[model samples]
Each structure stands twice: as C-alpha cells, then as structure tokens.
Target chain A: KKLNLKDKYQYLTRDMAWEPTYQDKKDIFPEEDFEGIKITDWSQWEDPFRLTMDAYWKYQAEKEKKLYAIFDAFAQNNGHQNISDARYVNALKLFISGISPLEHAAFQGYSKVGRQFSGAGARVACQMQAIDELRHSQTQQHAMSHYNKHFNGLHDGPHMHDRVWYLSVPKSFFDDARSAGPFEFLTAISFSFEYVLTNLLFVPFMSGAAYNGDMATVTFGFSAQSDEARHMTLGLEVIKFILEQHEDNVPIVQRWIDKWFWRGFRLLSLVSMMMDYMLPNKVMSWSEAWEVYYEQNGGALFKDLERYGIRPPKYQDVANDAKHHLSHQLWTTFYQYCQATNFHTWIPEKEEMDWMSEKYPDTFDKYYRPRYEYLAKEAAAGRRFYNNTLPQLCQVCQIPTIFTEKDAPTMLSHRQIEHEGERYHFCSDGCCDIFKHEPEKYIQAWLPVHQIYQGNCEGGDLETVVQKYYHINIGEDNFDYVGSPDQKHWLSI
Target chain B: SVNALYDYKFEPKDKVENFHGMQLLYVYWPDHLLFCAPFALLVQPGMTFSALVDEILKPATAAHPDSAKADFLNAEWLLNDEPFTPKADASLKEQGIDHKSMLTVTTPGLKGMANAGY
Candidate 1:
C-alpha cells in the first residue's frame, strides 16, 4: 500500500506545478529575464533535494522539540553562568543583534525569489530553504532569550537593527540583495553568501560558542547544521544549472560571483573582529580560518568551476592579504566607539595579545600590540576613551573609510567619486567599482552618519542617538567591560 | 548600468541641500587609530579654517596623550589626500574646502604613542 521514496519525491515536488492555461508565461513570471540571465529549458532543471511538505514539517517539528527542551534545560540550569567569561557574552550580543535578523532576511529573500522562478524544482528547493531560514530565526531568538533576560543590549535587537549606525552595515547588505532582481538575489544570497562565504561567519561564531561553554548556542548551531549543508548543495545546483543552460550566462554569472564575493567579504569584516577580539576563549585565528575555509577550500572549488569558465573572485588576493589586518583594524575601531555599541569592548589581556602575536607573527607585534599596550596605559590612568565623533560612512557598504591600502597599511585606502554632481564615498575600490556599475541603485543608500548630520536619526547628540534611537541602555549596555553589570553578574554567580 | 526593470533614479539622500545648508567636513589625524574612522563634522560655510582646527579638531583629539603638545594648525595637511597649504584666516570656501572635503593632518614628530600607528 505504501509507495517508495523516489516516486513520492517526484509527486510531492516536481509534479505539483501545472502549466499556465490562458495567461502569458512572461506575465506570470515577470522576474525571469530582467537580470539578463538566459534560461533555455525549464525541463533541464534538476531537483537539488527531495522531500514533501509533510516530511519537512515532521523533521522540523522533531528538531524544534529537542531544541526547545535544551533551551529550557539551559535556562533552568543557569547556563549563562557556565560561559568561559562574561566577555564571551559580548560575542553573543553581536551575534544576536547582527546575525539572527539576517536569517529572517534570508527567509524573505528565498521566499520572494522562489516565486519568480518558472521551474518547479528550483521553486521547491527555495521554498524548503525559506522555511528553514524562518525556523532558524525563531529558534535563534528563543535560544538567546535567557541571556537577553540578564543582558542589557538584547532587549531591543530587532528594533535597533532597523536604525542603529553600525547595524546599517549588515542591514544594508540584505537590503541591497533583496532589492536586486530575482536571479541576482539568488546569486547574491544563496550562491555567493550562503555557499561560498557563510562558513567564514558560522564556524567562527559557533566554534567560539562551543569553546566558551555556551551550550544554548551550540545546540542551536547543531540544529541548523544539516539545513546549512542542504542550502549549500542547492546553491551549487542553482549555479551549475544556470551555467549549463547557456554559454552566454557565463559572464553574467561570473560578474555576480565577483561582485557578491567582494560584498560578502565586506559584510564578514564584522565577524573578523568578533572572532579575533570579542571571544574570551579563542578559536583558530581569522587568518587561519580564511586559509582553510576560503584559501584551500575555495581554491579547489574554483578549480572545478574553471570548467564552466569561472575564476576566483577578482579581489581574493586583496581579501587574502587583508586577513592579517582586518580584525585588528575593526577591533580598534569598535574599541574606540564602544560608547555607541550595544556590547562592550576592552583592551586584550596579556595572554590574548601573545596569542595574537604568534598567530599574526609579522603584524601583531608591529602594528596592533603596541596600540593595545598604549590603550591599557590610558585606561589605567582613569581615561578610558570613546571617540565622540560620528564616522564618515561609505555610501555603499556603510562601513567607515578606515581600511588602509593593502600594500601600505598605514595610509588610508579610502576612495571617492563624483557622479551627476554629487560626491560618493567608499571604504575601498571594490565598493567604488560596484557603485560605478550601478549608480542608480546605490545613489539612494541610507548612510547613517550622514543621516545624523541631516537630523533624521531622532537625535543629533551621539549619546541621545544611542539612547533614544538605538535603544541601547547608555550607562549599563555600553562602554568598557571592565566594570559593568555583566561582569558583576558573572562574579556574583 | 543598473539592470533594473523600471526607471530607477533618485536624488542622493545626503546631497548638500539635505544637510540644512551646513556642509560636512571630514578630519583624519594620521597614526591615530584610536579615533577609529575619520571624524565627520558639520561646519557652516562661513567658519574659518583656523576655527575648524581650534574648535573642532582640538576637542576631538583631546583624549589622546599627544593632543596636549600637537600643533594641528602648523602640521602638514592634505586636502582630499593631495598636499596643500591652508591660510588659517581664510574661510573654508576661500580655501576651496567644499562639501565633503577631507582634511588629513599629519604631525611628523608625534608618530602616535608608539612606533606603531595607534
């Protein structure tokens, strides 16, 4: 009476879609060719994975049941106390505010893009992943609720994400992708971000959680691990299918890969600082992770992609060179601007500096170590510092123009251009070129610093902006972690 | 070049008119990584270059140990990364400092606290 898995998969996924009877196909699928990608045959589209809606719901429910039990056990057991140090929770703060919303954004991205595709197989895969992302966002928030109960910043994460200055970095990333045409959105989010670059973000944050003894986060990480693998395979299948459809699609796909790769690297610059400086107990260095995940792994992947006329991302050499300096530069930036952030920042202790020195042998002792030593000296003299001025943000990525040239790490690599009687700023060349290609798209970027100057962010005074607009609890939520409620909470526990 | 389905065109959000007639000026103090990014300050077009140094730059860098001894007015300067000399008494407009002009100040003797550019 029971059917086998193969036929059941076809009926549930591929066979569900019916041909249009009277309406024009292009009118129904308005987004198919707007991005200049050519799809020759819908029948050639292969299903990346097979599962019915019932099966999906069943497995997801089981995972949610187990995940919630662990969340409850974690809460009642005082799991926050089990962390390596209170400093480790700052990493969670960054994750909760910066990342969890990105899952929801991915859900929205997948859901919208799936409808634009004519192929049922691609639609089915995207639909499943959309649900996966929605589930991940919900579970991720639930997983961190206990910590939010005790912490200062997590109270208004979703609210802060919409308006905060620093939050603009990640918020604008997803905004840029979703506003793009359907094919570009998939290439940007699913292929370029989810498959190619997400490991650099995930492994660092999750491994930091595991190493720091946060069982709640580790449990959530495991819950999404299998789905992440599925997303990666689907990303590959989409890229391969598009490439195989027509040779003319090669250059279009390559440009998307290059553009999104640079964009992803810029977005992950936030993670580099968190990995190297925010975690109390360290995982591998950011450089090492890049070497393993991107340098070696991506190298092999691109070699295989070479058959389809693909090459490594254009700025990969710059990104590879930047591994030594990215975290150091970003940490120093946040170290001075702690007064505005939801999380705390501090100078690294001696052992951590030594760890960095060895990991970044040629750079740490030369560039970053002395800076920390000087900051430690200043803090000891009762002058812990905060930069009161708002930073000039890149019109595209919204990151500051603080990154130095790759060859000369001292001088600024900031770039500027004039288009249609207006000047635009960029953190680097990649962003500048990205803007040059699409002036109309980026011309309307919601640059937060400029917004403050324009009096749109609710308060002109920086502190008032943090308190009123960002909803960060000024005295307790921000500043150095040395003498704070979070530290005191840990000690009392 | 923007591959869009519709006519996508709009005025830039931070165009000079949007700043309520006050222009944004950026100041970068070299070797001072402690300030994170270059400071974006709003200045009236009538403000003199000397006042920009005394009123804006001095207070912004006050926390640094080097601030007490540094001379920003006399320091080597770069306007938008090209070397230039400014007349202290000249208005910012008189010195060709327009909206979004970046002024880089380098104190040669004070190479930051340590040899490293911090």
Candidate 2:
C-alpha cells in the first residue's frame, strides 16, 4: 500500500535516520550538548507544519517562479518610475541594507541549528526555515535589483551591514542570537523574533510597499508572508515543545524570551521610524501598529503562556511607554545625522507633520515638532545642518544617544557601567542587564563610533571614512533629497 | 571667549556667574535629570584635570548620593565627545573645555547592576 504525504514525510524524515555507529550521538551533535535543558523523549517532537521535503520544494519552486516573473515585469515596465517619490527609494534602500541581509543571517543561523539538533522533527523544521530565510533574502534582493540599477546606496548591502552605524543595530541583534547555543538561539530568534515581533517588522514595510505601488516588493511580500505563517507556527511549537519536555526549560526559555524580546524591540526602533516616517502613503502610525501587533496579539499570547509560569518580557512596559515617542526620537536621529547615513533626509511636508501630531497628540506636538521646525527653518535658509559630532553609542544595542528616559520624554535615557575598567553605555535598563549578565560577549562589540575614534575605520579623514568605509557617496547617496539629483530628475520628468 | 569655542548657542540651565574671570561651568550628567549639583564653580585656568574632576564630583555626590559610589578614580570626562584624561594635571583651557562646553562625567567598567533600574 502506498503511503499518504504525512506518512511518507514521517518515514523519510525520521524513520530514514540510522542509529549512530562510528560517532556517538554526543559527538554528532556536540553544540546541543550543553545549557542543561533535558529532552527525555526526542520522538515526541512534532513538525507543526506537517511539511515534508517533497511538498516544501514543490511549493517553494512555485513561489520562486511567480516571484521572478513579477520581478521581471516590474523592471521591464519601469515600476521604479511609479514609486510615490524619489525619496521613497530611501525606504527601499534601508530595507535592502538593514533588513534583507538579516534574512541571510537568519538563513545561516537556522542552517546551523538544523544540522546540530538531534530530533528529526526540530531539524526538519529548522531546515525548512533555513530555506525560507534564504528565499526571503534572494527575493528581497531581486525585488530591489531594479532600484539598484538607478541608485547609489543600494549597491553594497551585505558589506554595509557590517560597517554602517545604523545597520549595526540589526546586525548586532542577529549576531547576539546566532552566537548562542541552539536551544537558546531558538528561543531568542524563532520564539521572540519570528513568533512575537516579526509582524511589526514585516507587515509595515510590505503593506507600505503595496500602498506606495511597489508591485515587485508586494509580490515578494505575499510570497514571504505565505511561508511566514509556518515559521511563526514553528516558533510557537518550539517553545511549547521544549517546555513540555522538561520543567527546568521554563526559566531558561523565560530568560531568553525576556532578553530577545527587548533586543527585538530595540531593533524594531528602526522599523517604528520607517513605518511612521518613511512610507510615502501612510497606512498606520507606529503606535497603532504596536497596538495591533504587540499590545493586542503579543499581550494575549503572553497571557496564554501564564499557565507555564511565564510572564511578559522584562521591558514590556518600557516598550509600551515608548510607543508614542520611539519613532519621533529615532527619526530625529536620522534627520540630524543624515550625512553619516546612506539615505536622504528632509522635513516632512506640513500635512504629514500635522498627521504625525494628530497620531501622537500627547507627545509629538509638545516635544518633537519644534525640532523638525528648527531643521525646516534651516533648510529654508539653504543651510541644512548635519550633525558632525559623533554620538556615543550604547555598548550593547549599538544605537546612538537617541532613546529618552522610560517615563520622561523630555530627557534622554542613558545607563552606563564600568565593566572590567572599560566604560559601557546602554540605551535602557534591559540592554544594561543583558551586558551585565555577559560582559565577555558585549565588551568585544565593534562599536562604530569608538572604531572611528580609535583610527580603526576606513581612513583618517571623516569624508574618506564615510566614502571608503561606509561605501556611501557623500552628496550622492546622502543629503537633502529635496534638491537632490534624483529629486531633480523626477521633477524634470 | 568661551562662546568663541563652539558655534552653537550658549544657554545655561541656571544663571551664569563669573569667578576669577572664568565663568562658573555647570557640569551635567549626560542623560540624568539636569543640573549635576546645586552650586556651580569656576575652575581656575591653572587647575589640574584631577581638581576639575573633583569640582564635577562635588556636585554629583551632593545631587545624588547613590551614584557617588560610581568610582571617580576610574572615571573619565567627555568634552564634546572627546575623552579627557581625568588624572592629567591640565588646565581647563589647555584641555579645550571652555565654560560653553559641558563636561559629562562617565565611569568605566560595569558600574554594577544598580545602574540599570527600570
């Protein structure tokens, strides 16, 4: 009798595996050998997706074919010309450099965990996620390829991910998670990132792309979203699987959830700003996005997890408090430090600023509006100011002095410690705690600001440093997009 | 003369007073609530880096006693984001820290978990 797809999947994925002969199971999977979380029954692990290797390839191939066809149509039809504004391309450039590379990092991370895990179910899920991540990375690049042809900053995304200051925020997040042991990594990324925080990251940009008429990205977005549901399920299953296997895994998973949730939230500061400030045709404010994605969904998810002695993340309240102010603060950093970045910055049109004020009635009008107006006054006088002074970065998160105090929006939030005689600064209590827990890992951080001062960067001069090191053309890739060449060309056309 | 050192506006949180021809420099904690100490002081042109740090610490300890334990021996000052060696016996002018420039006192190493109170 012929086996159905599910039975065939179980047979090939699990039953095909042979007992170890030459090497012991410990030697075969040495990395998962530590962290003290025990799994008494490996067979109990189940693939929530019920995805077999054959069906995975078949669907992925179909998605790839559809995605490529759209990419070709987008480029052939000059889809780049239809984007809301030339300035909108800056949003895409940020996505390619800051986000797409992370997908690749996720790919490598999952592949490592896939190979190292002892359970066939967990390994297959990880391998599938590895493939999904790789697909996401490639499709994102393919979608952005048309823009790269006419753009300056979009060329060297992978290289920029390592050296750029702003990109370090996302880079450090993945690097921190990947460096952890397999189980901890699963908790950090699959659970906290994919399950808890991914909607906040992907939904905004993908929908923003659709709203702004970037059909190529919208196509890729739908394709990736189809796979994302499974990945999120895997994330949910992984957490439940570990907790069910052993009672001791509770605290470890909780700690990881706390750490990664905060890290993911910090990393999403970029997204918050993008959602609020970057999109040409705004869908929802960052605060609203947080309300729907995290406050409602994640809040409910945590309440469910209460059965297993798990609570919300350590900094959930802080993140909740920051919803009103996070985007404005982060955008102010980008606006001031435009020259140091690869994207252009400009004052939002009056209507847009008004929209922001309406969305953030309590904070935007009082705290952030005047600052933008000050920059607008400068821009009007043809003397746009760019912050040349280097900002002191948080040693753990690697973000600049942008975050404000948890309760006080008027003042900046700064925390520091003298760790092993060297000073380390943090944007918040959560980051400070993470560093305090592991000084050894954080102290070795390649802080971009410190790197420039230490003469370890590209060149001696600031211009040369930005040019050679950051791979950004000073006036071409950066500066006021209001009168930029791209804007000028668009205007003439 | 102090205003000539930087291009930005010079606005102090409190009234600026002159002492021995030098303005009373009000040191501030970078992100902590404003005003490092109750009273500001003038560091003489001949004052050493250690003496200047002492002046900054005097106010910090008075303002928040809990942070007084954040060892000044290992502390360094940041003037316009440049590291100012605390142990050096240099004048305020020689160190390039004018009255217009606010010196931020930062201690090195993990100052302890107490600093990260949410």
Candidate 3:
C-alpha cells in the first residue's frame, strides 16, 4: 500500500525527520528542550484543524472582497463623518500605529517557530497561522488606510511603532516573545494571549468601532473573527499537548502563563483606555470587559485546566482590582503626555463623564473624575497640561511607571530592584517579578526614555524628538483634540 | 530558572555612561496624580541637592496648586522608599543618589487637590 502526502505526513509524524537525518535530530531541534518543556511523544500532538492552502486561498479571497468593498464604501460615503465623533478615530489611529505592526510580528513569529517544531502536525498548524497572520496585517492596513487619507497621525505607523515611547509597549511584547525559544513563544502568544485573554482586546475594540459607526473597522474585525476562532483552537491544543505529554511540563507551562498574562495585561492598558475613553460611543467599560472576558470566561478556562494542576495566574487578583482603575489611570497618563502622542486627548464631555461615573460608580468619580475636572479648568484657563519631563518607564513592560497599587490606587505601585549595582524601576510586583526571574533577558531593554537621553534618538530636545524622531506632527497631530485640526476638519464638514 | 540555550547575562542598559555622564534621577510627588508618572530627570553628578530641589523638583511640580506652599527642601523625603534627609549643600553623588535613583517627596499638609490624589 502506498501513502498520500497527508497520510505520509501523518504516518511518519515527521516528514522532515528524515530530511535532518544527516545531522543529529537533537541538534536540529536544539530549542525544544532549552525552555525545559519535555515532550515525550511527538506522535501525541494533534492538528488544531486541517485546511489546504488552496482552500485557504479561496476562503480568504471571498473574505477579502467583502472587506475591500466596505473599505471602498467607507471612503466613498465619507465614513469619517458618520463616526460618533472625531475622537473615535483616534482609537483607529492607535490601532494602526500600535497594533497593525503586531500582526506582522506574529507573521514572523509563527513562521519562525513552525520550523523549529519536530512534529509535522504542529508545524502545519503554525504554517496556517503564519499565512493568516500576514493576511491580517494586510487587511488591517487597507481597512484603516481610508481614514489615513482624512486623518492626522495615521501615516508612519510602522516607523512610529519602532521608535515612539508608548508604541514600544506593544513593540517590546512581540520582540520579547519572538526572541524567546519556540516553546515559550507558543506558550506566550498562543496559550496566554490568544486563548486566555484575546477576547478582552478584540471584543471591546470591535464593539467600540461598531458603536462609533466605524464600518471599515467593524468589517476588519469580522474578517479576522473566523481566523481568530481557528487560532484559539490551535492555542488550546498547544497548551494541552505540552501538559499532557509529560508531568514535568506542568510547572513550566504554569510559569509562562503567569508571565505572559501579566505582559498581556500591561499591553492591553492601551486598549483599556480606548474602551472607556477613546470610543465616542462606548460599548463596555474596561472593568465590564474584564469581568465578562477574563473573570467568567478565563475563570472557567483555568478551572478546566486544574485537572492538569494548572492554577489561575498568580497576580489575577491584582488584575481584577485594577479593572476599576486601569482605564482611568492610563487615560490620564496619555492625557498629560498628549503633546507627545500621535492621537489627541482632552477632558471627557459632561455627558461622557456622567456615563463613566455611572459605569464606574466605585472608582471613576472618586479617583478619576476630579483630575479631569481640574484639567478642564486648567485648559479653560489657557494652561493646557503637559508633562515636560520624561517618564520613568518600567524595565519589563517599558510603560511609564504610572500604575498605582491595587490595594492603594492613590499611592503609586512602584518597585525598585538594584541588580549588578544599577537600579531598575518597575510599575508593580508583577513586572518586577518578571524581571527577577529573567533579569538577563530584560536588562537589554531599549527603553525609549533612556535612548532619548543617550542621544541615540534623532534630536536632543523635546520638539525634535517628537517631530523629527517620532514623526508626530507638532501642532496638527498632537495635543488636545478640542481645537486641533482633527476637530476643526470634522466641524467644517 | 532562565531556560535559555546559552549564557544570557548582559550589562544593564541603565549604566551611568548611557546618559553621557548625566545620571537619571526620578522624583515622585506623592498623591499628585496630575503629574502622571514620576519624573525621569537627567542630573549631573556635581549638581547640589538644593539646586535639584529649587531647579528641578520645584519647577516640575510648580503647575500643581500645592507648588506655592510646598517646601520640599524641608518636606519629609524618602530615598528608595526609606526616610532620609537631604544635605542642602551636598552633590547628588555626594548624597549617594546615583543612576536611576528615586526620591519620593511627601507634601504632608498638601494631599493634592481635594485629597483625591490629584
């Protein structure tokens, strides 16, 4: 009996197992054991699902047409006019500058890890994802390009994401994942971000787009939605295979989940603010999203994983407490530094504040609303607020150390670790713990604030850095949206 | 527990020379959320503590309403989360505030605007 290609791949379990026969298999898959995840049987791993490249091409071709037509219709109808407000577009701006590049990174990430896997089934799964991720990157660029034609801060996304301070928050995450071993990359992006906490980001942002009448963005979300469902299965299988293969793999998987969960939580701080503040018409508060997406959904996920002895993430309580204050804290940080950001920021309107106050009855009115009230007063007095000096960024997350303690939101949740005779700062115990575990890996962080001071950035002064280096327009792109070009253009229309 | 393929230890990027001889000093204005994160300022080793208070710290917090009454030179100070007193005449290095050192200035009577950490 002869075997077909699929059957050959299935039966051998390693089509390339013979290809690397010249070299020792151990040397070829050197990274497989470095992360300390023991794989006893390559044969035990299952494919998330099977789809031929031909079928992928046909399906994506159909998806592309629908998404492309909406992008065209959005431009033709002047979809910019129909959004809840010009402020809503800033979320789209953040999406492009901060997020679109991540898809491209994932493209590289999946392809890089796929080759390292000894298992044919796992490699094919990663290959499918690699193709889909690149597609996602392109689809997002096209969908958001319509608004780029009419908006400030949309151009230079790839450039800005590389050098900008805040964009580094997302950039460093992928950089960290891609730089790690194949197993950690899969655990970090696949299980932790994709399976555990992806909905918190996607569900809210897409709903935010829909609520704000952003047709192009909503379609982009839907276009990616099916692929994400498929990817979730891949992530689940990745975790289960690692755990079920060997008993020793449990602790290693547990640590990666803990580490990546905190990393993702920090990354989503940007999304948190977008949900509660950036969307001109809000769908859900950050706390609301956390409750639904993380609490109920992820709570059940870890419960099921308990049979494998996997517990909930170490710092989930802190994350839970932070939901009430996360959006408020992060938004205010960006607001003060609005002068440096590509998107604009301003005090929430009276109606908006009441909505926030109503949604966040516990924290918004108490800890957050007063700052806005004060900022509004200052702005009216012709003294718009700006943080002139650089911010202290966490070594791990690379965000400005703005987060306060979950127990005490007023007092900052700051930690200092002095290792090898130099001091490093962190936002919380979670970030610092990541450092303590892997200090060697994180010590090489290209912290934007440090780079600017090192004279590595294009210019010496603030204006030059924000303008020449970061590509943020001085007057047009940044500062408050109240009287900016984005606002002025929206009104004149 | 760093399960890397090879030796991964490297010098921290926050080394003193990275700033071109001006070390990074962070000043936190406790309870003042208006300032966002703590200030990451470049300070020369020769600069005095008094000048830092007068030239850097005071000016950074000048926008806050408490700036007028805030006497940070006499205010309760914390160096790396420990209570400390700054010698007005001593240099930052002389006082042991080196690269990435953090100073927390607690303005006791001034608990930010309306005491909401603002």
Largest DockQ belongs to which candidate?
Answer: 3
Candidate 3 iRMSD in angstroms:
1.2
Q: Residue-wise lDDT of candidate 3 within A88-122, one digit each (tens)?
A: 88998899999999999999999988889888788
Q: Against the true structure, what is each candidate's TM-score?
A: 0.97, 0.83, 0.97
Candidate 2 whole-model C-alpha lDDT, 0 to 1: 0.75
Ranking by lDDT: 3, 1, 2
Candidate 3 regions off by >4 Å? A1-20
Winner by DockQ between candidate 3 and candidate 2: 3
Candidate with top lDDT is 3
Q: Which residue runs of candidate 1 sit more than 4 Å off their true CA positions?
A: A1-8
Displacement of the residue A298 alpha carbon in candidate 2, Å: 0.5
Q: Against the true two-chain complex, what DockQ does each candidate achieve?
A: 0.76, 0.04, 0.81
Tell me the TM-score of chain B in each candidate: 0.94, 0.55, 0.94
Question: Which model, 1 or 3, shows the larger DockQ?
Answer: 3
Clashes of 3: 0
Candidate 1: fnat, from 0 to 1? Answer: 0.81
Interface RMSD of each: 1.2, 19.0, 1.2
Candidate 2 lDDT over residue span A1-493, tens digit each:
9998777778878886778999998888887646667888888887788876678888888888888988998899998888876777888888899999989999999999999889987888899899889989988888889989986679889989999878899998889888777888898888889988989988988898888888887788877878889989988888888887889889877878888988899999898888888887888999999999999999999988888788889988999999998887787678767777888877788888889999999887766676666666666777676654456577778887567777776555666566443445677898888888767667667767656644567676767888989988877887778767678876765
For model 1 the local lDDT of residue A400 reads 88
